[PDB]
C-alpha cells in the first residue's frame, strides 16, 4: 500500500571534517522540528574487487571526496584559454 523505507538517523555534534583532516564540535539543536525534504539526484558508489570479470559484482555506497560532488555537476564543462 504505502510501504516506505524508514532509515534510522542520528544527529552528531563531534564530526570528522570534509574540508581538511580535522575534527569539529557544534552546539546541540535548539529546534524541535528539524525538517528536510531533499531530492536524491544521484549516487556515488564503489565496487568489491578480487572478482574481476566474474559472475557477480558487489557495489557499495561511497562518497567522502566532496570534489566528486562538484564533478557530477561540472562534468560537461571546461575552461579554455581565450585571447
Amino acid at each position: 500500500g504505502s510501504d516506505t523505507i524508514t532509515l534510522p538517523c542520528r544527529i552528531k555534534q563531534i564530526i570528522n571534517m570534509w574540508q581538511k583532516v580535522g575534527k569539529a564540535m557544534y552546539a546541540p539543536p535548539i529546534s524541535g522540528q528539524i525538517r528536510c525534504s531533499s531530492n536524491i539526484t544521484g549516487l556515488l558508489l564503489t565496487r568489491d574487487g578480487g572478482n574481476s570479470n566474474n559472475e557477480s559484482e558487489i557495489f557499495r555506497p561511497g562518497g567522502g571526496d566532496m570534489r566528486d560532488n562538484w564533478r557530477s555537476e561540472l562534468y560537461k564543462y571546461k575552461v579554455v584559454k581565450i585571447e
Binding site: 532509515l7 529546534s31 539526484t41 562518497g63 560537461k76 571546461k78
Partner: protein, 170 residues
C-alpha cells in the same frame, strides 16, 4: 595540533545556487551531448558565459538537490576497472528522502527499488550484457562515509542506509 574555540553559533545553513562564469581570459565550453559520458571527444559543444544553476550540497553516498540525466541513467568513473575508484551515478528520475531531527529519514520503497534495477542495468561490467549485480553496504570507515551524512536544517545527520544498499539483481 591547533584547537580553535570560536563562539560556536546556532545559524541556519542554506544553499544558494552558484553560477560559475568565465574566469578571466578563458572561456567555458559546455558539452551539449545530452548523454555525455565523462572523458572523451565531445561532438556537440558550445561556448557559454556561465555554467548553470549549481546547488552546492555537501553530503555523502547520495547526491541531492542536483542535476538529473535527461535521457537515461548515466554512470561515470575515471577507471571502471580499478575497484578503488569512485563511480558516480546520474539518475533518470528524482527520488525523495524526507527527514526530521527526530532520528529518521523515509524514502518511498517502490520509487527507490526501481532506480536500483535501472542502475543495475549497467554496472561495472559496463552496461554489461549480463551477470549478477549485488548491492551491499559500506565495509567500514568514518561515520560520514559509512552513513548518508548531510547537513539538514543546519544540523548534522548520520542516516544508517543498510536498507538502501542490500539487495541482489541480474
Amino acid at each position: 595540533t591547533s584547537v580553535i574555540t570560536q563562539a560556536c553559533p546556532k545559524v541556519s545553513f542554506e544553499p544558494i545556487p552558484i553560477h560559475y562564469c568565465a574566469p578571466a581570459g578563458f572561456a567555458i565550453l559546455k558539452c551539449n551531448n545530452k548523454t555525455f559520458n565523462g572523458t572523451g571527444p565531445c561532438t556537440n559543444v558550445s561556448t557559454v558565459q556561465c555554467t548553470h544553476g549549481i546547488r552546492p550540497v555537501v553530503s555523502t553516498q547520495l547526491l541531492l538537490n542536483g542535476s538529473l540525466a535527461e535521457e537515461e541513467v548515466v554512470i561515470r568513473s575515471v577507471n571502471f576497472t580499478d575497484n578503488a575508484k569512485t563511480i558516480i551515478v546520474q539518475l533518470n528520475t528524482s527520488v525523495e528522502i524526507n527527514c526530521t531531527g527526530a532520528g529518521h529519514c523515509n524514502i518511498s520503497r517502490a520509487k527507490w527499488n526501481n532506480t536500483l534495477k535501472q542502475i543495475a542495468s549497467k554496472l561495472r561490467e559496463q552496461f554489461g550484457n549480463n551477470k549478477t549485480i549485488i548491492f551491499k553496504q559500506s565495509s567500514g570507515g568514518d561515520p560520514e562515509i559509512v552513513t548518508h551524512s548531510f547537513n539538514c536544517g543546519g544540523e548534522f545527520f548520520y542516516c544508517n542506509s543498510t536498507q538502501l544498499f542490500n539487495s541482489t539483481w541480474f
